[PDB]
Amino acid sequence: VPWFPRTIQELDRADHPGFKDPVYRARRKQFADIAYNYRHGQPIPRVEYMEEEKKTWGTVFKTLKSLYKTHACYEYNHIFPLLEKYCGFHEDNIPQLEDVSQFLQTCTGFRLRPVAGLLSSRDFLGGLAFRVFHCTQYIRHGSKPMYTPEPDICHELLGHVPLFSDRSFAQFSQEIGLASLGAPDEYIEKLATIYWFTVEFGLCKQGDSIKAYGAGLLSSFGELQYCLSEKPKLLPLELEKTAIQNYTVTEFQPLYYVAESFNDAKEKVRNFAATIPRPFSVRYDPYTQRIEVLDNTQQLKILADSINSEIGILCSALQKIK
Amino acid sequence: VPWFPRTIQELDRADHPGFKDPVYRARRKQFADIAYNYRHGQPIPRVEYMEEEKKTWGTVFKTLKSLYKTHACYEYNHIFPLLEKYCGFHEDNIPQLEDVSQFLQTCTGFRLRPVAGLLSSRDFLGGLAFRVFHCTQYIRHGSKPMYTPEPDICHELLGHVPLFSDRSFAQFSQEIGLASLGAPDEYIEKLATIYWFTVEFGLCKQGDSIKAYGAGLLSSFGELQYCLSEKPKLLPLELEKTAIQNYTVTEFQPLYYVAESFNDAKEKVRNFAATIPRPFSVRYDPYTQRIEVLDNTQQLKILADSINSEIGILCSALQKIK
Amino acid sequence: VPWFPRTIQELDRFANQILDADHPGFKDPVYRARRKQFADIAYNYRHGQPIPRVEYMEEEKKTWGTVFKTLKSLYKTHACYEYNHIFPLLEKYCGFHEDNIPQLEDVSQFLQTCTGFRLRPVAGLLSSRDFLGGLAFRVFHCTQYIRHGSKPMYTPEPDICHELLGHVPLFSDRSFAQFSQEIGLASLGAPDEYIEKLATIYWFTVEFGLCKQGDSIKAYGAGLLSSFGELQYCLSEKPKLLPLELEKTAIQNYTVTEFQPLYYVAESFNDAKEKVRNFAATIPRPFSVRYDPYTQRIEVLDNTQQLKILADSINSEIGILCSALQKIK
Amino acid sequence: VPWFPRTIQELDRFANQILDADHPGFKDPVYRARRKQFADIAYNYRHGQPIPRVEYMEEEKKTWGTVFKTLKSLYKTHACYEYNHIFPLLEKYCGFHEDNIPQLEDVSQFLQTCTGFRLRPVAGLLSSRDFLGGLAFRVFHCTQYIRHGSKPMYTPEPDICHELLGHVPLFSDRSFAQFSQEIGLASLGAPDEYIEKLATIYWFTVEFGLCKQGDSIKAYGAGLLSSFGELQYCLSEKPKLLPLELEKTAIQNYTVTEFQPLYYVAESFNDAKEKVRNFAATIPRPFSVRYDPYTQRIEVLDNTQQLKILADSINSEIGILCSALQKIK
Ligand SMILES: [Fe+3]
Ligand SMILES: [Fe+3]
Ligand SMILES: [Fe+3]
Ligand SMILES: [Fe+3]
Structure with missing residues (x-):
């Protein structure tokens, strides 16, 4: 059985444009080093971004800001003005991770973590189990401010x-x-693939119409308008036949699985999760920020207790809503 | 309706022996100031305790260490060697709050908070809702190392x-x-009274025999041996008639309500809690460390979801235990 | 592990056929052979067939009306609501009148349409285990006979x-x-x-229990309602009332021939039912039972599979509770 | 809101009494008046009374055996387990033999002891709303008549x-x-x-559904089992099978007179039942229903109180799940 983090602190484990640039190069190595030195618990170090960079930021912050109220999903259009008004989301300044992380934490509890560059799907996904997102502190090269070979x-x-x-x-x-x-x-690979047709390039349901909620879609100008047109052959978010689906990395996907809702996708996910054959079950404890392996009979005595009390709340509440 | 903290950070709101001592006096004012300056999020400041103090600590750490395996409850005798081996629990050194707090957090999630001196039952109890304990950094006067007029x-x-x-x-x-x-x-007063005959001066059930789990009992040498004898008239932990019960502050209580278990007392408490007539219900969110007021129909949609997923775990786990 | 009925028809073992001077009427050769007449009916009664009817005698019908009159007055007063509500329906339907003794087949047939409870004529008396066992099928073991007319205000048994x-x-x-x-x-x-503990509970509840009707207390105990002297006694300020707490109620020791100073006050029957549901889980049983009203059959489960069964049940109910919330905005 | 039966006896409205050339036997004056004989039985049938017995004719008994023989061979082969299991019991009990047509009173009386399902003779056909409504009481509206002997391998209706x-x-x-x-x-x-959506589901499940028996697929559909030609067709590799997904199954359009290329494969009946439980919550109804097998009565709840009911139910089950864990160490 593959090894996985039990504690939150256990996460401590030429075609490219700008390859010929000695500065940007050493700059991106500067960012990576920050990652390698970052240990959970301490605030994400701040960085003084350069204009050649701030320009590229605003070039993307302008090109996409127009198509969000249009193509982007509601939950996006709702939080944006709060991100802009709070985490410094403006085309003139690049937002600091410590701020965004500190922010996201009060919303859902999701904290950011600076990742060197890239990591396995198993490692990436593993962070999600703790509501931890491995983010890149660096930025694409200004040569082509409308294209990035990676996050x-x-x-x-x-x-x-x-x-x-x-x-x-x-x-x-x-x-x-x-x-x-x-x-x-x-x-693991199947989940990654799902993560793609959902988190990366997924489309949600907003009444009758379809909106884009995929991260790869929202950050990409060319596909933001493409996924919303009547060219791709849409299909329902069905994790069963979605994991089998093979996709291209460098180009647009004709397939974009339409999920009813995240609350809804969640259930087919849990299902796909129930599909995952594991010799046990694990539960996350937000208080001890540990990962609980449910295999013992006493391990269940306590989860039972957690629920018992929570419903007791759900009931009392309901009882007061006549 | 009384005001209560919604966020964890919102908690930011002569007979005495040593009264004639100008040093100890200004010393205890030194500790209090630490409290007044302490804001959530930052580590609890460490202090260099004095020998006249370290002596009093060891005088109590010795007098009580003998009666714990005897009169103290199991959960106590179990964790002690871990407290001693970890948070520096030894008669020769006074344990630092930042350590204990940092420790307790990994066990249950309970964090310590230095309180000036004393506070209302409403305020004290309010901290518990966030698994936050308001602790005193100071120490009794060495004159009488076997008696303290307060925590x-x-x-x-x-x-x-x-x-x-x-x-x-x-x-x-x-x-x-x-x-x-x-x-x-x-x-509020009723709960405080319960808190007394439970947390402060409560006795638990360990098979057939009775042990002391009350905080006021364990820290007090004279009552530790008294509550275990056949002099006081024991009664069952019945929150209904326990809240009415009137008690003395300066002396021993003939009444010591015997709780089956903390998991068990918890249910009569929830009951006594269900007794509490509030125009709503509240739920704590460990991720956003906020206090959720359940009054809206959408507020319940999400608690429902929390439970739904948690049982789904409880089931999958159970399904794998044949 | 004691033997218990799996099917509703298995209660035929209670009244198989095979397997006291102080009593008023012990010296009466007629009433005696009369009460043996009733018992025989029981021994011959098998589930499924209608309860045989009987032509009660006046010496009996008099005793019936003597009790039907003495108690009818104190019901709207001391008896609980659910009682005062159904009575006029019992009177208007099952022939509940001081001039005629109601026929079991009628009462049974009646009760069945209300809750599903069917009556069953019991010879005389039976173990608590046997009595309670009938309840699992919503079957009540009733006595077809009647006390002796000598003392129409006292009965040494049901x-x-x-x-x-x-x-x-x-x-x-x-x-x-x-x-x-x-x-x-x-x-x-x-x-x-x-078993004995449950019986004791059955007493301070079904037999001699008092319920909650707003602020006041009413009598819902069967032993109370049928007894004139205790009907007015339990309602007074002489006995020391206590809350229906099955934990310390099962330990409580009581007298059989006289009045009980203790009468546990239950909030409601709906409330107590739960106090029993869990109490069952707190009962040492190398298994768990499950009744099927569709096949009138009891199912015996293995704690482990019983565990799994609960899990699925919960997991299901919640999701629906989730969907329910969604449409209700 | 459409009217629906609250009581099991309220189904007497379906077969009140008041309120096609291509058919084989349309030109037959006897069979015709015979099938009107059967229907009348239905119109006169009221719940509670035993289903009248009928003396079937040889011209009929022949058609029965012609189908009882043609299908008996393909059951152990294509039919599902639950079918192959109960058959020898149906044959050994309800007179299931090619030489005699089984009497409804027997089958009904039988089915009742198995699950509680009682049969009810229906004139001919009825709305999906009416048909399904009977199921809520575990009541099946069955046809007492039989196809015409002309074509003993085809029936235009049940x-x-x-x-x-x-x-x-x-x-x-x-x-x-x-x-x-x-x-x-x-x-x-x-x-x-x-209603129409459910009917459609009822089709790709009860009528023409295929279940899961390990790795292989078996036929459990009623329309499949009674039809010789489709019994062997649904089991072959010609139709394009799909998973029982009530979401996209209700939309699916099908033909009535011929074979369906689509046959939704359900894991189990226990599995599907849930797919229906929730689907009900996803149904726009200004209320929620609840059946009481003890009083054979349906209870109509108000979404709000229904909500509260679920809460208590969950809250209860969990605590017991808590106690259950405690004793099991
Ligand atoms: Fe990404
Ligand atoms: Fe204290
Ligand atoms: Fe009785
Ligand atoms: Fe059919």
Whole structure:
């Protein structure tokens, strides 16, 4: 059985544009080092971004800000003015992670964590189990401010973050994290694939119309308008046949699974999670910020107690709503 | 309706022996100031205790260490060697709050908070709703190392702390905290009274025999042996007739309500909690560390979701235990 | 583990056929052979067939009316609501009048449409385990006979008056039936100590219990309602009332021939039913029972699978509670 | 809101009395008046009384055996387990033999002891709302008549063969009954759109559904089991199977006179029952229903009080789940 983090602190474990740039290069190595030195508990170090960078930020912050009220989903359009008014979300200044993290935490409890560059799906997903998002502090090269070969502070901030501010989305994400914990490769890859057609390139239901909630969609200008058109062949979010689906990395996907809601996708996920054959069950304890392995009979005595009291609340509340 | 904290950070709101001592006096004012300056989030400041103090600590740490395996309850005798081996619980050194707090947090999530001196039952109990204990950093005067007119670092550390390390006890305490939130004076006082015959001077059930789990009992040498004898008239922990019970402050209580268990007392407490007439219901969110007022229909949609997923875990787990 | 009925028809073992001077009428050769006549009816009664009717005698019909009159006055006064509500329906339907003794087949047939409780003629008396066992099927073991006319204000044991003007009216109430049944399902295979404990509870509840009707207290106990002297006594300020707390109620020791100073006050029958549901879980049983009203059959579960069963049940109910919330905005 | 039966006896409104050339036997004056004979039985049938028996004719008994023989061979092969299990009991008990047509009173009386499902003779056909409504009481509206002997391998509608050698065996299974009943409780007062949706589900499940038996697939559909030609067709690799997903199954449009390329594969009846429980919550109803097998009565709840009811139910079950854990160490 694959190894997985039990504690939150246990997470401590040329075609590229700008490859010829000695500065940007050493700059991106500067950011990575920050990551390698970052240990949970301490505030995310702040950085003094450069204009050549701040320009690229505003070039994307302007190009996308127009298509959000249009193509972006509600939960996005709702939180944005709060992100702008609070975490310094403006085309003239790049938002500081410590702020966004500190912010997201009060919304859902999701904290940010600076990742060197990239990491396994098992590792990425594992962070979600603790409502921890591994974010990139760096930024794409100014050469092509409309394209990134991988996640940059724009994709993470103007794509992922706004969704992680939504109550229903967080639990949903966390589910996948709890699922991936100790899951066999085949399923790990399957979840990643789901994570794609959902978190990265997913489309939600807003009444009759369809909106874009995918992080890869929201941060990408060209696909934001493409996924909303009548060119791609939409399908229902069915985790069963969605995990099998093969996709391209460098280009647009003709398939975009339409989820009813995050609260709803959550259930097919839990299902896909129940599908995950694990020799046990795990539960996250937000108080001890530990991961509880449910295998013992006394381990269940306490989860039972947790629920028992919580419903007792749900009842008393309900009893008072005549 | 009385005002109560919604956020954890909202908690930011001559007969005495040593009264003639100008030093100890200004010393205890030194400790209090620490409290007044302490704001949530920052580590509890450490202090260099004096020998005249360290002597009094060891005089109590020795006198009581003998009667614990005897009169103290199991959960106490179990955690002690861990407190001694970890938070520096030795007669030669006074334990630092930042350590104990940091410790207790990993056990149940209970964090310590330095309180100036004393505070209302409503305020004290209110802290419990966030699994926050208001502790005294100071110590009794060396004149009479076997008596304290109020809580000192000995009563809090060698009386309360060990119980707050127990999983079942924490939820129990928290219940009272959640109960007291916005509760009318009459009930606030009633809860305090319960808190007494339970947390302060309560006796538990350990098979057939009776043990002492009360904080006031464990920190007090004279009553530790008295409550265990056949002189007081024991009664069952019945929150209904326990809240009415009137008690003395300066002396021993002939009445000591015997609770089956903390997991058990918890239910009569919840009951006594259900007795508390509040125009609503509140729920604590460990992720956003906020206090949720359940009054809206959408407020329940989410609590329902929390439970739904948690049982789904309880089921999957159970399903795997044939 | 004691033997218990799995099917409703298995109660035919209680009244198989095979297997006291101080009593008023002991010297009466007629009443004697009369009460043996009634018992025989019981021994011959098998589930499924209608309860045989009987032509009661005047010496009996007089005793019936002597009790039907003495108590009819104190019911709207001391008796509980659920009683005062159903009575006019019992009177208007099952022939509840001081001039005629009600026929069991009628009462049974009646009670069945109200809650599903059917009556069953019992020879005389039976173990608490056997009695309670019938409740698990919503079956009440009733006496077809009647006390001796010598003392029409006293009975040393259950007679058609105690059963009809005491138990029956309560078994017509929806909440009370499930409650009773709980005890029945509890007693199924329960160890003696707990069987006796339940009986004791059954007493301070079904037999001599007092309920809550707003602020005041009413009598709902079957032994109270059928007894004139205690009906007015339990309602006075002489006995020391206590709360219905099954924990310390089962320990309580009581007298059989006289009045009890203790009368546990239950909030409601709906309230107590729960106090019994859990108490059952607190009962040492290498299994768990489950009644199926569709097949009138009891199912015996293994604590482990019983565990799993609860899990699924909860997991289900909650999701629906989730969906319910969604549409209600 | 459409009218629905509150009591089991209220189904007497379905077969009140008041309120096609292509058919084989349309030109037959005897068979015609014979089938009108059967219908009249229905119109005169009131709940509670035993289903009248009939002396079937040889021209009929031949058609019965022609179907009882043709299908008896493909059951152990294509039919589902629950079917192959109960059959020898149906044969050994309700007179299921090619030489004699089984009497409804027997089958009904039988099914009742298995799950509680009672049969009810229906004139001919009835609305989906009415049909489903019977299921809420575990009551099946069955046809007493039989197809015309001209074509003993085809019926334009349900006949005593389809009902007995197709539906009945499934209604003998514990899990299937509750499942069916769910739909019945669902349809109670449900708006047309959903009524039709349920019917459609009822089709791809009860009528033409396929279950899961390990790795292989078996036929449990009533329309499949009674039809020889489709029994072997649904089991082959010609139709495009899909998972039982009530969401996209209700939308699915099907043909009436011919074979369906789609046959939704359900894991189990116990599995589907849930897919129906929740689907009911997802149904727009200014109320919620609740069946009481003890009084054979439906109770209509107000979403709000229904909410509260769920809360208490959950809150209760969990505490017991708590106590259960304690004793099991
Ligand atoms: Fe991403
Ligand atoms: Fe204290
Ligand atoms: Fe009695
Ligand atoms: Fe059919």
